[PDB]
Amino acid sequence: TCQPSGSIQGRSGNCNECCKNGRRYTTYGCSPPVTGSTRAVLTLNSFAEGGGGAAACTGKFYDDSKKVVALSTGWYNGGSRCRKHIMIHAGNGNSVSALVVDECDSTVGCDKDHNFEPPCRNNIVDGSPAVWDALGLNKDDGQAQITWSDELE
Amino acid sequence: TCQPSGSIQGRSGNCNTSECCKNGRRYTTYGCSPPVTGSTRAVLTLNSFAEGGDGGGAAACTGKFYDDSKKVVALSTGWYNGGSRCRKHIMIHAGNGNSVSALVVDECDSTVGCDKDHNFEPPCRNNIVDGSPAVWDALGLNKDDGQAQITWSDELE
Amino acid sequence: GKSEAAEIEAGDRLDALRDQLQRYETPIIQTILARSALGGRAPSEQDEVRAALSRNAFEPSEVISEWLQTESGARFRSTRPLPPAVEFITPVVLSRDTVLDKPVVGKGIFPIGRRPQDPTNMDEFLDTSLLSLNQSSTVDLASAVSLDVSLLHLVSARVLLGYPIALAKFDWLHDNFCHILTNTTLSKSQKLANIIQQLTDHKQEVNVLSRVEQKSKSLSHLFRNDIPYPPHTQDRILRLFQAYLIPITTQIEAAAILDHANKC
Amino acid sequence: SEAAEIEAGDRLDALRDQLQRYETPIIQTILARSALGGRAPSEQDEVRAALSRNAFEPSEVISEWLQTESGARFRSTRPLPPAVEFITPVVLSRDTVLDKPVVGKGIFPIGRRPQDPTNMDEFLDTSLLSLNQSSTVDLASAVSLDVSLLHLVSARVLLGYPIALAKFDWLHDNFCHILTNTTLSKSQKLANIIQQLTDHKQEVNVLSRVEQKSKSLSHLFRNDIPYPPHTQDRILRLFQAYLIPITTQIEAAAILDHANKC
What we know:
Radius of gyration of chain A: 15 Å
Largest sheet of chain C: none
Largest interface: C-D, 48 and 47 residues
GO molecular function (chain A): enzyme inhibitor activity
Order of helices and strands of chain A: EEEEHEEEHE
Subcellular location (chain A): Secreted, Extracellular space, Apoplast
Order of helices and strands of chain C: HHHHHHHHHHHH
Number of domains of chain C: 1
Strand order of the largest sheet of chain A: 3-7-4-6-5-8
Shape of chain C: globular
Strand content of chain A: 25-35%
Radius of gyration of chain C: 20 Å
Structural class of chain C: mainly alpha
Number of domains of chain A: 1
Distance between the termini of chain A: 30 Å
Number of strands of chain A: 8
Number of strands of chain C: 0
Subunit structure (chain A): Monomer. Interacts with Cmu1 of the fungal pathogen Ustilago maydis. A structural feature specific to the fungal secreted Cmu1 called extensive loop region (ELR) is required for the intimate interaction. Does not interact with its own chorismate mutases.
Largest sheet of chain A: 6 strands, mixed, barrel
Protein name (chain A): Kiwellin-1
Helix content of chain C: 55-70%
Distance between the termini of chain C: 18 Å
Oligomer: heterotetramer
Keywords (chain A): Apoplast, Disulfide bond, Glycoprotein, Plant defense, Secreted, Signal
């Protein structure tokens, strides 16, 4: 079963969520098992250009109207879901198809490369605003419990 | 009085058929223009100062290009006078009684021509006001003229 | 604790070194474009580049120089007069038909390393680029050779930053690397593979290569009456980073960590 | 006589293309060095030593011209390449506006103000000295880019020599009228020839393009360190105050000794 890969000493550097100095942050190379109804935490992210890196699958940026996601490293699975779709289900009964474009990197964090932010958790679907709106979820919540599965085409 | 400075052997290069220089004839160069009298007789020609057009290089007074709606002109080297009229206006009078104020932005270079730098076109003549399309339209002249008899004067302040 | 403080310096040190690594991107790209814009290949240019490197030999720093003597480091020592790492050959890792520069469904983009048909090392890659130009009787030998020599020093210095980066990464992620280094199940060869894998972050690689492609396109803009760049100029700029600079840097980093296994 | 003028015009067109071809390499090389980092300890000395150890000699045509009386004015002290020590006379005022359109004058006036460095060697040395000292910049890379730039600017202005020979055949009568004038002193002939060679509208065309290139090629991308202040200004100044006027003087010097061909 999926175990941590290690941990990193927090540094807040110049980040204004930021890593905090007195702690350690865990890293992961794996994610939970992928089932036909995979339980995950949906977070909120913008994939647009300006003022974060290019999307891992394509080297591109995506404006907030695009329904795109990043997956925790384990689910990202070396790129095997790149430019494939996943079906996301929210607890309120809404669902949306989203394009996998990026990795939510759980292997590294708390450095200038990641704006001194912590490493992604290992069960994350990091969704654009349009994913949240399609799910009828309140973007002020910051995170939501979801399920997802690989979609056919 | 104003005399030619010399002449240049025509070469057509890759120019199409604005007139190209023709092989087998020479083209006169001038450093001077006729006297500026305050109602100076000139030939108005037609030119585009726009960037895309490939008619020309950047404007001598400013290093810029000008779209055809701007009322701007180039002056023969002598009247251009080392830049003394740069970003000043001249009042142009056409034979039909219309007049227009135009901004001087460029030199119609009479010292050189028939080379790749000028797309194998001849050196400007020495008595030219080379006007944008908006200059001709403001004067009510038919651009199919190609050239018109005018008079011009500096707009002093 | 004493440990925690040492890790924190280490991250601070790594951040600064990473900035230094990225700072080579634009100079390498500008130097390639300058030589490509300048003209064709001069008679005996390759020979003149070696003579220039021989006559104007810059020696590496003392720490690197010694490292180059040690066996691990000696695989990055070049035949004189070439600078360090420009002869190092990474093993072929891609297939002949690997798609290099567009998104591939189910894989991603910008796969790193050499295909069988790629030149073995950076010296040969740049030599091959030079040979693809026609011999020119008008190109200035001094300018051309000087830009060639500039590029060789730039690419060498860029990848050699892997060594101090590796030392900073080792202190920053001490437990991660020692868990590999002290594993008595692994051969020396398997430890190298696992270290390289721990050092590899392809999402960061895509970030770099996306920007390199963008820079190469933007900086190769033609202005009025300019002579065009030779075909594939932008492709070869990307290939330099994707097939050589990134994987060689990583390998230098892994080599360095392995040299400091006694610190576990 | 027609045919020779035609040939010369053709030849001039090709040489002008070769001259313009230096624009982008010079600008990219300045930007590469500026993006790279600060100044290394003893960088200037290392530049001189590199020039000595990798001494490129000019072509036999250039090396022999540099032995003639007019050409000798462009021979530099070893190990510097030709023309990089040549000093043009001050022609601008301290407050002359350099890079904006001036009512009643124009734009991009050529040449040196009293405060400009005397020659290209000093100009590039002043640029290098304006950088901060750095302990992280790679000495080999920095010196190699410095040397590239010195070789580029020398080769660029030396194209004035073959350009002048072609212009002489193309505009034979114009120059011969000056050269065979027995009332003019040597220096008045030099002045009149320089004026015949000067076309400011073409100069504005080049400098406008250099300004565009310097802006476009200095574009900043994701997480890039900015260029030092005034990097673009000094690129323009290199062309406007040195490369263009020195090229014109090289052309004038080449013409001046050609009265026997009239």
